[PDB]
Amino acid sequence: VQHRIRITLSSKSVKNLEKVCSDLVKGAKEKQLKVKGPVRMPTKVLNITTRKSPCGEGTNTWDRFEMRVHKRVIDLVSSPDVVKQITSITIEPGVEVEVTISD
Amino acid sequence: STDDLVQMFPARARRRFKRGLKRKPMALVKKLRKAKKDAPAGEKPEPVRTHLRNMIIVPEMIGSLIGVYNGKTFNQVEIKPEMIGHYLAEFSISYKPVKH
Amino acid sequence: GKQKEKVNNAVLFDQATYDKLLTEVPKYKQITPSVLSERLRINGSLARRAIKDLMERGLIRMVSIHSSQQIFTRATN
Amino acid sequence: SRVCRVCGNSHGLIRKYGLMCCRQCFRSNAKDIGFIKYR
Amino acid sequence: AGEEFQHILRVLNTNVDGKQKIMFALTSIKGVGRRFSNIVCKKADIDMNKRAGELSAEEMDRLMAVVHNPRQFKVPDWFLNRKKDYKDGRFSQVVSNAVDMKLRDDLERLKKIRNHRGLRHYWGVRVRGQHTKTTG
Amino acid sequence: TVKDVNPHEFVKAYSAHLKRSGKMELPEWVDIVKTARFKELPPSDADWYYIRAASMARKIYLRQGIGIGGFQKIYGGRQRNGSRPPHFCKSSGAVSRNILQELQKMGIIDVDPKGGRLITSQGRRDLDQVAGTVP
RNA sequence: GCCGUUUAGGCCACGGAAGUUUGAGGCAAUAACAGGUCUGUCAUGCCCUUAGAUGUUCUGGGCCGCACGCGCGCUACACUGAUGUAUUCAACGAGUAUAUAGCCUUGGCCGACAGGCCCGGGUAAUCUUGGGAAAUUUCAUCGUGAUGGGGAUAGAUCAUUGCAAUUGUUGGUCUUCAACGAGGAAUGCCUAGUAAGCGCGAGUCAUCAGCUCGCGUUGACUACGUCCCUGCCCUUUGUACACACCG
Ligand SMILES: [Mg+2]
Ligand SMILES: [Mg+2]
Ligand SMILES: [Mg+2]
Ligand SMILES: [Mg+2]
Ligand SMILES: [Mg+2]
Ligand SMILES: [Mg+2]
Ligand SMILES: [Mg+2]
Ligand SMILES: [Mg+2]
Ligand SMILES: [Mg+2]
Ligand SMILES: [Mg+2]
Ligand SMILES: [Mg+2]
Ligand SMILES: [Mg+2]
Ligand SMILES: [Mg+2]
Ligand SMILES: [Zn+2]
> Is the C-beta of residue F63 closer than 7 Å to nucleic acid chain G?
yes
Task: Give the 3-state secondary structure of residue C75.
Answer: coil
Residue A97, beta-bridge partner list: A9
Strand (E) or helix (H) holding F40: none
Cβ distance E34 to F41 less than 8 Å, yes or no, reads yes
Search chain E and give the residue with CA nearest C13: E1
Cβ distance A50 to D34 less than 8 Å, yes or no, reads no
Q: Which residues contact D1 (CB under 8 A, 6 or more apart)?
A: none
CA B98 / ligand 5 centre spacing (Å): 32
Cβ distance D14 to A50 less than 8 Å, yes or no, reads yes
Residue A50: which region, alpha, beta or left (left: phi > 0; alpha: psi -120 to 50)?
A: beta
Angle of helix F121-131 relative to helix F7-20, nearest 10 degrees, comes to 110
What is the 3-class SS of chain A, one letter each residue?
Answer: CCCCEEEEEEECCHHHHHHHHHHHHHHCCCCCCCCCCCEEEEEEEEEEEEECCCCCCCCCCEEEEEEEEEEEEEEECCCHHHHHHHCCCCCCCCCEECCEECC
Angle of helix E116-123 relative to helix E96-113, nearest 10 degrees, comes to 110
Cβ proximity of A94 and A10 under 8 Å: no
Cβ distance E123 to B97 less than 8 Å, yes or no, reads yes
> Cα dist. B46→B3, B54, C39 in Å?
30, 22, 81
Residue A11, beta-bridge partner list: A70
Cβ proximity of E13 and E29 under 8 Å: no
- Measure the CA angle with vertex F75, ends F72 and F76; round to 5°: 75
A39-72: burial string, b at 16+ Cβ within 10 Å, e else: eeeeeeeeebebeeeeeeeeeeeeeebebbebbb
Q: Which residues contact F112 (CB under 8 A, 6 or more apart)?
A: F64, F65, F118
Q: What is the DSSP string of chain B?
A: -HHHHHHHS-HHHHHHHHT---HHHHHHHHHHHHHHHHS-TT-PPPEE----SSPBP-GGGTT-EE--B-SS-B--EE--GGGTTSBSGGGS-SS-----
Touching, E vs C (3+ Cβ pairs under 8 A): yes
**Cβ of residue F45 closer than 8 Å to a chain E Cβ:** no
> Cα dist. C57→B4, C23, C48, C60 in Å?
65, 16, 14, 8
Search chain B and give the residue with CA nearest E112: B82
Cβ proximity of F75 and F35 under 8 Å: yes
Strand (E) or helix (H) holding F80: strand F77-81
Search chain C and give the residue with CA nearest E1: C10
Pairing of strands B77-78, F84-89: unpaired
d(CA B13, CA D15): 35
**Cβ of residue E19 closer than 8 Å to a chain F Cβ:** no
Rounded (10°) CA dihedral F91, F93, F97, F99: -30
Q: What is the DSSP string of C15-61?
A: TTTTTTTTTTTTTTSS---TTTHHHHSS--SSSSTTHHHHHHHTT--
CA pseudo-torsion sign E51, E56, E57, E61: negative
Rounded (10°) CA dihedral F28, F32, F34, F35: 10
Q: Which long-range contacts (CB under 8 A, 24 or more apart) does B48-53 make?
A: B49/B74, B49/B76, B50/B88, B52/B24, B52/B25, B52/B28, B52/B88, B53/B87, B53/B88, B53/B89, B53/B92
What is the number of the ligand closest to the CA of F80? 1
Residue B71, beta-bridge partner list: none
Distance from residue F116 (CA) to nucleotide G128 (C1'), in Å? 15
Cβ distance C14 to E54 less than 8 Å, yes or no, reads no
Q: A63 contacts in D (CB within 8 Å)?
A: 27, 37
d(CA A92, CA C9): 92
The secondary structure of residue E73, as a DSSP letter, is T
Angle of helix F48-61 relative to helix F7-20, nearest 10 degrees, comes to 120
Task: Give the 3-state secondary structure of residue E31.
Answer: coil
Cβ proximity of C6 and C47 under 8 Å: yes
Alpha-carbon Rg for chain A in angstroms: 19
**Cβ of residue E24 closer than 8 Å to a chain F Cβ:** no
Task: Give the 3-state secondary structure of residue E111.
Answer: helix
Task: Determine the number of helices (DSSP H) and then strands (DSSP E) in chain E.
Answer: 5, 0
**Cβ of residue B97 closer than 8 Å to a chain E Cβ:** yes
Share in percent of chain E as helix, strand, coil (round to 5): 45, 5, 50
Cβ proximity of A53 and A70 under 8 Å: no
Our CA-based measurement puts residue E115 at a distance from the nearest CA of chain B, in whole angstroms, of 6
Nearest Cα neighbor of E53 from E25, E32, E31, E12 is E25
d(CA B18, CA C71): 62
Number of Cβ atoms within 10 Å of the Cβ of A14: 11
Cβ distance D35 to A66 less than 8 Å, yes or no, reads yes
Q: D23 contacts in A (CB within 8 Å)?
A: 50-51, 54
Reported residue count of chain D is 39
Number of Cβ atoms within 10 Å of the Cβ of A90: 6
> Is the C-beta of residue E27 closer than 7 Å to nucleic acid chain G?
yes
Our CA-based measurement puts residue A87 at a distance from the nearest CA of chain D, in whole angstroms, of 27
> Cα dist. E20→C7, C54, E51 in Å?
10, 21, 5
Cβ proximity of A74 and A38 under 8 Å: yes
Task: Give the 3-state secondary structure of residue F91.
Answer: strand
CA F109 / ligand 4 centre spacing (Å): 61
d(CA A48, CA D18): 12
Which nucleotide has the least CA–C1' distance to B15? G159
The secondary structure of residue E12, as a DSSP letter, is G
> Cα dist. F92→A39, A78, F35, F108 in Å?
43, 54, 5, 22
d(CA E82, CA A99): 67
Search chain D and give the residue with CA nearest A94: D34
d(CA F133, CA C64): 24
Q: Which residues contact F39 (CB under 8 A, 6 or more apart)?
A: F91
* Backbone φ and ψ of B77, nearest 5°: -130, 150
> Cα dist. F129→A95, B47, F100 in Å?
60, 83, 21
Enumerate neighbours of F (3 or more CB pairs within 8 A). E
Interface test with E, best of B80, B87, B90 (most E CBs within 10 A): B90
> Is the C-beta of residue F74 closer than 7 Å to nucleic acid chain G?
yes
Cis ω before A38 (30° cut-off from 0):
yes
Cβ proximity of C45 and C4 under 8 Å: yes
Structural determination approach = cryo-EM
Cβ proximity of D12 and D22 under 8 Å: yes
d(CA F135, CA E30): 50
Q: Which residues contact A64 (CB under 8 A, 6 or more apart)?
A: A47, A48, A49, D37, D38, D39
d(CA C76, CA C62): 8
Cβ proximity of B67 and B48 under 8 Å: yes
Amino acid letter, residue A16? N
d(CA F59, CA F127): 12
Give the experimental resolution in Å. 3.0
Cβ proximity of C14 and E1 under 8 Å: yes
